[PDB]
Amino acid sequence: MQVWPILNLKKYETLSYLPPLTTDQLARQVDYLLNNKWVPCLEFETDHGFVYREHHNSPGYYDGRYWTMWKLPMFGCTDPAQVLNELEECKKEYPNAFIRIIGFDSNREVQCISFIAYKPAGY
Amino acid sequence: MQVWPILNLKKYETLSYLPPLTTDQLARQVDYLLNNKWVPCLEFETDHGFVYREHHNSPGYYDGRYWTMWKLPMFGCTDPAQVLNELEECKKEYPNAFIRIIGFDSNREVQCISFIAYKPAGY
Amino acid sequence: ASVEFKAGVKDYKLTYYTPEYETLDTDILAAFRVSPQPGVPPEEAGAAVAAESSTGTWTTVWTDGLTNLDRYKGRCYHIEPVAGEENQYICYVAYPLDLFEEGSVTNMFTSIVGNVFGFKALRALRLEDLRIPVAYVKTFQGPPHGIQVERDKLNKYGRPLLGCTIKPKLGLSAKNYGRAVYECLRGGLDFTKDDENVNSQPFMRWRDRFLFCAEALYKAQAETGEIKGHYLNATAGTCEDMMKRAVFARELGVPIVMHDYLTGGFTANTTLSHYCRDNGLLLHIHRAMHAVIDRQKNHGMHFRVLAKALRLSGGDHIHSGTVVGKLEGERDITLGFVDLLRDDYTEKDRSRGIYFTQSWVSTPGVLPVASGGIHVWHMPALTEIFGDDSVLQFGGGTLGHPWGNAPGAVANRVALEACVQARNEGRDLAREGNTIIREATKWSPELAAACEVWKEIKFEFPAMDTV
Amino acid sequence: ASVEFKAGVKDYKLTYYTPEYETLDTDILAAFRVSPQPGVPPEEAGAAVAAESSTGTWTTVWTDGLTNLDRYKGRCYHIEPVAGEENQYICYVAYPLDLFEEGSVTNMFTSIVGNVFGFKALRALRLEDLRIPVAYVKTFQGPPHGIQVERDKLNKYGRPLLGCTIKPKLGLSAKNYGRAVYECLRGGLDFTKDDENVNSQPFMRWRDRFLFCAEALYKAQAETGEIKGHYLNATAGTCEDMMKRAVFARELGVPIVMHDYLTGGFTANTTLSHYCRDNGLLLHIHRAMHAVIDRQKNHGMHFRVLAKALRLSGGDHIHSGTVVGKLEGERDITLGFVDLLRDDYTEKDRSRGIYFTQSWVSTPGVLPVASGGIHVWHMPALTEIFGDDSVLQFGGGTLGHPWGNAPGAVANRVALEACVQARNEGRDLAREGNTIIREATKWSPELAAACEVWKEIKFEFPAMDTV
Amino acid sequence: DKLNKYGRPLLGCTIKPKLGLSAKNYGRAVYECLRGGLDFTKDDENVNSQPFMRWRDRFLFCAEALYKAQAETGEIKGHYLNATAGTCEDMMKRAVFARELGVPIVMHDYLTGGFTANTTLSHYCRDNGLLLHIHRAMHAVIDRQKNHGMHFRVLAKALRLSGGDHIHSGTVVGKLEGERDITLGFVDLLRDDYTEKDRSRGIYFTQSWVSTPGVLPVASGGIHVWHMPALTEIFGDDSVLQFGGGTLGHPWGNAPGAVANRVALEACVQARNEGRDLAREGNTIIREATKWSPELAAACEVWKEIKFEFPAMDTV
Amino acid sequence: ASVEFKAGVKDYKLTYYTPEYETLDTDILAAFRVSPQPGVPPEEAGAAVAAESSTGTWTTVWTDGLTNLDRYKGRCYHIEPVAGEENQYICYVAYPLDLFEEGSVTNMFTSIVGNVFGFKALRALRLEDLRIPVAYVKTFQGPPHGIQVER
Numbered sequence A, B: 001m002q003v004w005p006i007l008n009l010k011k012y013e014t015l016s017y018l019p020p021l022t023t024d025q026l027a028r029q030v031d032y033l034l035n036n037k038w039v040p041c042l043e044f045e046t047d048h049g050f051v052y053r054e055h056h057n058s059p060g061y062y063d064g065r066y067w068t069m070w071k072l073p074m075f076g077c078t079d080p081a082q083v084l085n086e087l088e089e090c091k092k093e094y095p096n097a098f099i100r101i102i103g104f105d106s107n108r109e110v111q112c113i114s115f116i117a118y119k120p121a122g123y
Numbered sequence C, D: 001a002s003v004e005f006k007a008g009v010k011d012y013k014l015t016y017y018t019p020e021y022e023t024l025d026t027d028i029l030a031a032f033r034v035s036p037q038p039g040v041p042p043e044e045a046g047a048a049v050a051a052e053s054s055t056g057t058w059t060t061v062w063t064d065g066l067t068n069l070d071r072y073k074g075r076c077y078h079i080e081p082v083a084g085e086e087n088q089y090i091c092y093v094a095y096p097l098d099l100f101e102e103g104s105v106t107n108m109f110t111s112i113v114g115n116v117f118g119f120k121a122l123r124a125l126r127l128e129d130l131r132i133p134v135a136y137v138k139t140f141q142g143p144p145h146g147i148q149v150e151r152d153k154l155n156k157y158g159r160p161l162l163g164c165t166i167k168p169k170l171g172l173s174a175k176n177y178g179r180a181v182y183e184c185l186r187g188g189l190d191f192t193k194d195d196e197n198v199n200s201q202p203f204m205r206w207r208d209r210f211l212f213c214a215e216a217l218y219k220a221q222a223e224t225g226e227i228k229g230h231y232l233n234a235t236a237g238t239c240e241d242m243m244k245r246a247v248f249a250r251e252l253g254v255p256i257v258m259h260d261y262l263t264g265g266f267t268a269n270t271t272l273s274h275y276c277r278d279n280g281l282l283l284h285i286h287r288a289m290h291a292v293i294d295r296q297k298n299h300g301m302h303f304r305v306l307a308k309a310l311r312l313s314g315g316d317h318i319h320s321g322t323v324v325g326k327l328e329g330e331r332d333i334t335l336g337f338v339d340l341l342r343d344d345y346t347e348k349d350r351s352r353g354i355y356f357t358q359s360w361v362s363t364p365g366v367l368p369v370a371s372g373g374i375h376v377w378h379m380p381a382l383t384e385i386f387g388d389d390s391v392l393q394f395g396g397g398t399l400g401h402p403w404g405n406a407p408g409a410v411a412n413r414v415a416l417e418a419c420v421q422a423r424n425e426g427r428d429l430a431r432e433g434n435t436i437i438r439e440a441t442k443w444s445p446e447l448a449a450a451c452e453v454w455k456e457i458k459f460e461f462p463a464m465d466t467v
Numbered sequence E: 001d002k003l004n005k006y007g008r009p010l011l012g013c014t015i016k017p018k019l020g021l022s023a024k025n026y027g028r029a030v031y032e033c034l035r036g037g038l039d040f041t042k043d044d045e046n047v048n049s050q051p052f053m054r055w056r057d058r059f060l061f062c063a064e065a066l067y068k069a070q071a072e073t074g075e076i077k078g079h080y081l082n083a084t085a086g087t088c089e090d091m092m093k094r095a096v097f098a099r100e101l102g103v104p105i106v107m108h109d110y111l112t113g114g115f116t117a118n119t120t121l122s123h124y125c126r127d128n129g130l131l132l133h134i135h136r137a138m139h140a141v142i143d144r145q146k147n148h149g150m151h152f153r154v155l156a157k158a159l160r161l162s163g164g165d166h167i168h169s170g171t172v173v174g175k176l177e178g179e180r181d182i183t184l185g186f187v188d189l190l191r192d193d194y195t196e197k198d199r200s201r202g203i204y205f206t207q208s209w210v211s212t213p214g215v216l217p218v219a220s221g222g223i224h225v226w227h228m229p230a231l232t233e234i235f236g237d238d239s240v241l242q243f244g245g246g247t248l249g250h251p252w253g254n255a256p257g258a259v260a261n262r263v264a265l266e267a268c269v270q271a272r273n274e275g276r277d278l279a280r281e282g283n284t285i286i287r288e289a290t291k292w293s294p295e296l297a298a299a300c301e302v303w304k305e306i307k308f309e310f311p312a313m314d315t316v
Numbered sequence F: 001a002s003v004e005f006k007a008g009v010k011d012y013k014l015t016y017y018t019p020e021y022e023t024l025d026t027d028i029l030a031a032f033r034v035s036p037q038p039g040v041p042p043e044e045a046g047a048a049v050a051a052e053s054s055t056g057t058w059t060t061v062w063t064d065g066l067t068n069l070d071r072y073k074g075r076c077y078h079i080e081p082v083a084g085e086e087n088q089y090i091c092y093v094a095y096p097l098d099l100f101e102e103g104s105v106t107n108m109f110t111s112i113v114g115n116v117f118g119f120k121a122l123r124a125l126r127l128e129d130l131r132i133p134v135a136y137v138k139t140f141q142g143p144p145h146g147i148q149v150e151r
Ligand SMILES: O=C(O)[C@@](O)(COP(=O)(O)O)[C@H](O)[C@H](O)COP(=O)(O)O
Pocket: C165, C195, C196, C287, C288, C319, C320, C321, C322, C327, C369, C370, C371, C372, C373, C374, C393, C394, C395, C396, C397, D057, D058, D115, D118
């Protein structure tokens, strides 16, 4: 009988209950996004890594959901090395931030992909 | 005329105005719980040891009342050494937590016992 | 099937004395202690009480034949002589479910206790008990919260709760009220309260007091780390005024308010009970005025009937007496109605004054409150009589302590925990009480000073209300 | 000027027995009949009642020094032994104006009658009378209308008014209620009414009854040409429910409603009193439950206190007893509280049970209502005791008549007018009563049939409540 | 977008014993479930307000619990508070207090409450930013038999008009009836803007929605970790998968139960996304995850034999 | 008094088939016409209906030990075979007063008829009749007027 731990067990939505993505596993998530013809985008955040409620409290209002856009969505991208390259550029400029990869479906106007790709020190 | 102190005089509900339980006194509280045929359970907390009001303020709403369950309530327990053994296991895994022992009455669905059994450093 | 109308008077017992009737499980049953005038046979006295608390008047009325009198009539179905008494009987009366207004204690009292106590033909009448059928119980809300929910809201388990009335009953200002409340709460009491008659007055207006008592209670909560309440009184002259005070307590986010249910009344109290359920407020009930009605054995209404009525109308706490303190209450009678207030089921038990088996079909239980002339040396007996599910209140016992309110509160909290530990360890509170207290004085200077002041004080007098 | 705080218990009489005190004209004065336990001197008993109904508790409290105890304390200022009684005294207690909440009977009772009746140190306690100072009287509305305005609204002058409770107390349907109301009102009664316990029930729901009783009363008004009323009962389980019934009566445009002020309670009754003033409704008050409290001489509260309390809270009618009918009430005591209900000023008069001179600074007077076991042969005595400013009600006496409700009403109306004419012509109602009635039977067949049916019926028993 | 949740089915859980738990034990159970990785917990369809647990106490304790699980985990949480009631006034009072607590989602039983009441609550939830979970209690009285009644697809279309953000859709593989092709048909009728006549899936008519928002289908009733691969294949990302028994029946308690289900679902999503076939490699995908997840391994041992396979009453 | 928690699935009839139970006068009683699938005994079918219309689900839950399952559980207390029918039974189920919200037909139907009609293990289910106890009747207003008052 094991007790699920309590301390420093922050999670990050889709895929964060799995083992850490290897470089091959990260590659395959970007292939999957591109194979479905979704638009990739990178987002980053240094200050509020998790969701909170500072300015309002009514149903469905949360702060911390918006992060900041790295450049623009990569419209027309077909090459996974571009996505991975921009991830390396974001990391170099913001080594202290959380960085996620998202993929947009413009017909539904819904993100169909979202996962954490890099985490700063101690996370 | 003595003045009742103000600083670092946090209290912990039933039994916390008495001198610290000896090992024999702790054993006798566990015997009492088992002799009334109540189900023992351990609960622990590292972050918010005392009660507070973060998410709401209406009558009867407080944060900090729920702690986290150590394994499950020990249904059918009749041996005090099991309870004390789980307390030692909880302490070893969470030496920085507050740990309490509770006893449930399932007919009334009321905890009939609750007391602090271990306190972390400086408490 | 329709007999002619015959005008004129005839005996009540021809229609309303019914010794072969079997009671229905939907009936309300009343046990009346009846003392007839000389020359009035017990059958006629019993019949008169049943008739005039249900369908009948003093002469025969033709309009009976438009209805079915036998399905609506109240009826005296059993008469039992009282041992050791000249001309005094227990008369049992049955009232059909259809006579009563759903959810209205007011209507139930109006019928059963309305006019019959002033009959010329009786010397005295006392309602001892009522059997409230489960089909009528289900028409009421009952307590707003009840015992289980109250402990879960407050996170308080494994000991009686501790309270305290602020003294000078009357005459303190709003700010001195809150000053006294902070110092009482910080020493280990869970609760403080308004005195039953502090409402709003020239020396202290209600809104000012609510506000200062909120600052004080929140300060004691933060210092100690334990949830605190102060019973803010909503009792008032009108329903509008009463509602305004419950509304401001709601706004302050505090856990508990109080009402004087007999002086305010049952129509008002049922209103407040419904508001407290709707708004998550605990409702403490004070029984001011009960002893006008319930003190004497020959005449009035026993407290157990008034306590059942409160459970229906609704309250989370009700004062129950202390047994050992300054106001009357016999041990066995008190244990009887404490069980009627807390439990789901109580069997007939004439040795504790329970005339009827009573079921509650899960109506929440009320917390009994023991208060009035008690102090640290009473703690062992109090804990033994009431057990964990009670509130023990020390007004004079806290604010009469030689070192002030905080040390007063410590002494009471230490004494109670000492008793709880000893009880839990197998010690006998009845026999080892003074030794348990004495042992705690060796490591608690606060309790030692309280013990010295009140060591001789006892309240021992002959009781007026015995089985 | 500040003496040290001394913890511990001491006698009440050191602070609260004050035989040299001169009462203030702003004080509330209480006359208590006190029966102490053996070994408790009357000074300490009187002190104990004063302390515990005002500012004191059982041990000494340090917080007294934050205020001025001597300006707030209640105080026993006079003690008088009861003639013919072992260990029973009249203790007089004075309470400062500042202790009380303006406009609240609830608060006034809570202090004076709240906890002291259950003291272990007393065997029995009865509150006999209260002196209500004119500065406190002016904080209350009093009756919605009062006697002058009621007669002017209804165009009724020069005789007692006539009413009638519908019988079977319970069990009639809404449409049979209205049928009975029409036949009563068309024979010459001014009013009919709901029985005190007819509220809303399975056999008859309230809104149905109000609506059929409005059709019936308007039909009798148009046939006879005289204004008619039916007291619709607003008594209910909650204030919201009570308010909804007063609202629909308003909508129907009828003149009068009723409330059971003790079973509903003072908080709810003051609310309804204020509503009836704001909306032009007469308010009939029924005193159901009073005899639980007021029957016995040793213990409780006398009816005169409960009647003063109603006058303050508010009502246009209150039941006053009949003296000669089926329920208890002694002539001299009754005349005493009838004067306290109707007049602007009543002097101390211990032979009628008036312990204090009482002034009303123009509070409207309440009409006394005589009801319960009376019939045509009582008419002369009733007219003599109450005079023109009363209502006399015959339920059984109308619905028990051999020829039905209309003829029953004629008999009562003819009897009353015969008494009024005879009195007005100089005849003596006490001595010529039976001859007055007998004369009227020669030209009134309806009265003749009523006279035959009830000629032997009398209610004569030893009274429990004597001066 | 409100919940910040993308790229997988959502995970819920009904609290069990259906009836009989107290207000505080409900909240205790909610916290432990939510902290282990479920997105949602919920009131059982028949938990309204009762002698064992009154509604306002339950709302209040479930708010404290959900907010504690949210802060521990870093992920938005919800608990479906039930507004079903005897009268509209009562129903409205519950939606009002949920609003006051600032919580994201309430629930309604639309057939037992009824369409008149349901439309009222749907308008209130649009006006106040509350998600609305719909439970279809009573539908099988009407829709079970092929000769007589009304098929569920008609009841599902009616709910989309009246209004709700979630509706129960069946599981196909668990304890209650639902055939794969008929289910796929009305799932498309609930989520999509346009659906062509297709008699093989029971669609008799081409149906258009002119941008009526889509309803998330909820799969619940008798499912557990070994069903995860098939559920993910049938419904895809836009669904909610609910495990009551399958969380509160776990040997180690609610948190570990929740971890097992969350790990199972992520394992399926990763494998699907890498090109693996969920229909054929399902058991291997679950089995692989049991090597690094003790919690899932305990859940797998307990329910390895459990299947619900019976003849269907409702066929094309 | 508290037995260990045992995870896993077991038959419904172990807890919810209760042929010796005497009905309380506060109980709601249901008469169900049950047609089970082949291979499902009538005891398990009746048990399944009672469990899933009251307190139980498909596998064993540890939280039963925080309450008193035996005072809340619905229970199949009698089974009668239908004359002239293959594999069809009248199953009688009892539900404690405390399961129901006062004054709510909606809540009463939600429990008794909510989910059990779509169980895979049944071919068909019909609720024929309900015994509504007088204590639950009194929580409802009933007709606004009724026959007497309308005339
Ligand atoms: O006025 C008072 O006397 C009290 O405040 C107690 O004061 P102390 O604590 O200072 O004695 C309580 O209200 C009484 O206990 C009421 O009686 P009961 O509980 O019998 O109704």
